[PDB]
Amino acid sequence: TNSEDKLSKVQLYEDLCRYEDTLSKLVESVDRFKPNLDIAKDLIRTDEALFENVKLLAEDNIYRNLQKIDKDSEELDSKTRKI
Amino acid sequence: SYVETLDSMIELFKDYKPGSITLENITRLCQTLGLESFTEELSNELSRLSTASKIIVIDVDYNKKQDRIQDVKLVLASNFDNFDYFNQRDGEHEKSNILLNSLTKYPDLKAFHNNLKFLYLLDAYSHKLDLFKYFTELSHYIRQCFQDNCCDFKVRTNLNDKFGIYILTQGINGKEVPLAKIYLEENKSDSQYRFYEYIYSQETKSWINESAENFSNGISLVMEIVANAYTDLIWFPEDFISPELIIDKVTCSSNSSSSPPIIDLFSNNNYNSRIQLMNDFTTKLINIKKFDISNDNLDLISEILKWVQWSRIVLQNVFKLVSTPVLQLIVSEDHIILDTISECNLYDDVKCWSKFIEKFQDIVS
Amino acid sequence: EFIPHIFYSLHQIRKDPNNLSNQLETLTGSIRHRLKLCKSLISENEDTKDLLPSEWQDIIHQREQELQIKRDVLDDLYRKLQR
């Protein structure tokens, strides 16, 4: 149950959320064959924000290195424990 | 109003997301302007995209291995082959091609689209008026008109990878600063507007229409003021130029109280305590960005530029110095008087304006 | 992949609105398809949604403090056992 709470905590989740909302507005506009510029510009800037957050996620690897050094920590602890 | 709104939305979408520089996006852009386009394989490594219209042919060489544009060539089907599509840089032996630069130096197609829209305008509206010839020669006629009128302005073609006739002044550091850009624009207001060829005659020292039979319809010669940008905006007396010649009036839309900073400076008591400011303007100040200088209005270029230069050197500096926290300072449309100490007017030389500002700064500091 | 397809379809929308309503409707349906698969792919994977900032610093601090206390106790053991 806490998983979804953690997922909602990171910004890019909200980013995909309002990106979906903006495309929903755009499709509603084109359904009414009345394309509103503000919806499209909101869509493009939200997409850009998505893409910058896509870069920001990548520099990931730090957590992975922390994970391997954590495994090193507990394996050293177990070794010294059996010692 | 639906078509005008749709065209305005299409222009907005074209400007807001110009697309990435790819062969497919360049082809789609050319097709969106009604240009005929074909792709040829010159080699296993090189493809050419050739695009054509009535007069213009543009070859774009694409390196398939590098994912990059290698070359761009413009060819005219006019009897005039001398159209300058290179940037005018003083002291570089390599004339840098505007079209190639717009596809290699920029992150997007916006620079290329603007330059292509300009070439397409000349193509569509050239017939017996050849606008490629006339626009090239016009830069020489304006340069001569300034020499004959003793105007200290430099004329360059094609500045910063953009088509246009650029009018430059010497700035305080001897650096050239653009004052205005002259170019052709579609006349949205009157498709029947006759645009004639005007030549500057060395003999008469005037603009002359040699061939009243040589006209194009639905085009205007536009003078755009290049703001270095609210304090860097140029303001004109409302009666300085006929309202029919004003293409773009910056309407301060009715929800932000930006008077000219000049008029707010007649209303706001936050002055240098040494100066009593007196307003002697008879007219309202309006912000004008674009002028129609077509036909008989080519004489106005020198008057508009003198005002723009006087406004930058005198008015804007007087305002900057008065606005930084008793002598009477009278400010009018064409003259400024500091009590009995110093005066300058719009018809004085630039050297008189500089001396007035130096003396004014020494008193206000 | 949905990102480049979204980009491209976005651009032929903004380049050619003068296409007949058939193309506009079909292309908008295509974008709705791509974002539908986008939201699905977001949905099944918890790890990405977690990916989708001081905690990393706190983990680094705890790792370095446990490392230094391990080094100190090992130095003490080395000093004591050599007798």
Swiss-Prot record, chain A:
One of its GO terms (biological process) is RNA polymerase II preinitiation complex assembly. GO terms for molecular function: RNA polymerase II core promoter sequence-specific DNA binding; transcription coregulator activity. GO terms for cellular component: core mediator complex; mediator complex; nucleus. It is found in: Nucleus. Coiled coil: none annotated. The keyword Lyase does not apply. The keyword Transferase does not apply. Its main location: nucleus. It comes from the Eukaryota. Keywords: Acetylation, Activator, Nucleus, Phosphoprotein, Transcription, Transcription regulation. Belongs to the Mediator complex subunit 4 family. Present with 1617 molecules/cell in log phase SD medium. Component of the Mediator complex, a coactivator involved in the regulated transcription of nearly all RNA polymerase II-dependent genes. Mediator functions as a bridge to convey information from gene-specific regulatory proteins to the basal RNA polymerase II transcription machinery. The Mediator complex, having a compact conformation in its free form, is recruited to promoters by direct interactions with regulatory proteins and serves for the assembly of a functional preinitiation complex with RNA polymerase II and the general transcription factors. Component of the Mediator complex, which is composed of at least 21 subunits that form three structurally distinct submodules. The Mediator head module contains MED6, MED8, MED11, SRB4/MED17, SRB5/MED18, ROX3/MED19, SRB2/MED20 and SRB6/MED22, the middle module contains MED1, MED4, NUT1/MED5, MED7, CSE2/MED9, NUT2/MED10, SRB7/MED21 and SOH1/MED31, and the tail module contains MED2, PGD1/MED3, RGR1/MED14, GAL11/MED15 and SIN4/MED16. The head and the middle modules interact directly with RNA polymerase II, whereas the elongated tail module interacts with gene-specific regulatory proteins. This is Mediator of RNA polymerase II transcription subunit 4. The gene is MED4.
UniProtKB/Swiss-Prot annotation, chain B:
Belongs to the Mediator complex subunit 1 family. It comes from Saccharomyces cerevisiae (strain ATCC 204508 / S288c) (Baker's yeast). The keyword Transcription regulation applies. Its main location: nucleus. InterPro entries: Mediator_Med1. Component of the Mediator complex, which is composed of at least 21 subunits that form three structurally distinct submodules. The Mediator head module contains MED6, MED8, MED11, SRB4/MED17, SRB5/MED18, ROX3/MED19, SRB2/MED20 and SRB6/MED22, the middle module contains MED1, MED4, NUT1/MED5, MED7, CSE2/MED9, NUT2/MED10, SRB7/MED21 and SOH1/MED31, and the tail module contains MED2, PGD1/MED3, RGR1/MED14, GAL11/MED15 and SIN4/MED16. The head and the middle modules interact directly with RNA polymerase II, whereas the elongated tail module interacts with gene-specific regulatory proteins. Component of the Mediator complex, a coactivator involved in the regulated transcription of nearly all RNA polymerase II-dependent genes. Mediator functions as a bridge to convey information from gene-specific regulatory proteins to the basal RNA polymerase II transcription machinery. The Mediator complex, having a compact conformation in its free form, is recruited to promoters by direct interactions with regulatory proteins and serves for the assembly of a functional preinitiation complex with RNA polymerase II and the general transcription factors. It is found in: Nucleus. Coiled coil: none annotated. GO terms for molecular function: transcription coregulator activity. Disulfide bonds: none annotated. Present with 4675 molecules/cell in log phase SD medium. The keyword Oxidoreductase does not apply. Keywords: Activator, Nucleus, Phosphoprotein, Transcription, Transcription regulation. GO terms for cellular component: core mediator complex; mediator complex; nucleus. This is Mediator of RNA polymerase II transcription subunit 1. It comes from the Eukaryota.
Curated annotation (Swiss-Prot), chain C:
Component of the Mediator complex, a coactivator involved in the regulated transcription of nearly all RNA polymerase II-dependent genes. Mediator functions as a bridge to convey information from gene-specific regulatory proteins to the basal RNA polymerase II transcription machinery. The Mediator complex, having a compact conformation in its free form, is recruited to promoters by direct interactions with regulatory proteins and serves for the assembly of a functional preinitiation complex with RNA polymerase II and the general transcription factors. Component of the Mediator complex, which is composed of at least 21 subunits that form three structurally distinct submodules. The Mediator head module contains MED6, MED8, MED11, SRB4/MED17, SRB5/MED18, ROX3/MED19, SRB2/MED20 and SRB6/MED22, the middle module contains MED1, MED4, NUT1/MED5, MED7, CSE2/MED9, NUT2/MED10, SRB7/MED21 and SOH1/MED31, and the tail module contains MED2, PGD1/MED3, RGR1/MED14, GAL11/MED15 and SIN4/MED16. The head and the middle modules interact directly with RNA polymerase II, whereas the elongated tail module interacts with gene-specific regulatory proteins. Transmembrane segments: none annotated. Present with 1364 molecules/cell in log phase SD medium. Belongs to the Mediator complex subunit 9 family. GO terms for cellular component: core mediator complex; cytosol; mediator complex; nucleus. It comes from the Eukaryota. This is Mediator of RNA polymerase II transcription subunit 9. A motif (Nuclear localization signal) lies at residues 14-36, 70-83. The chain holds residues 64 to 149 of 149 of the full protein. One of its GO terms (biological process) is negative regulation of transcription by RNA polymerase II. One of its GO terms (molecular function) is structural molecule activity. Keywords: Activator, Nucleus, Transcription, Transcription regulation. It is found in: Nucleus.
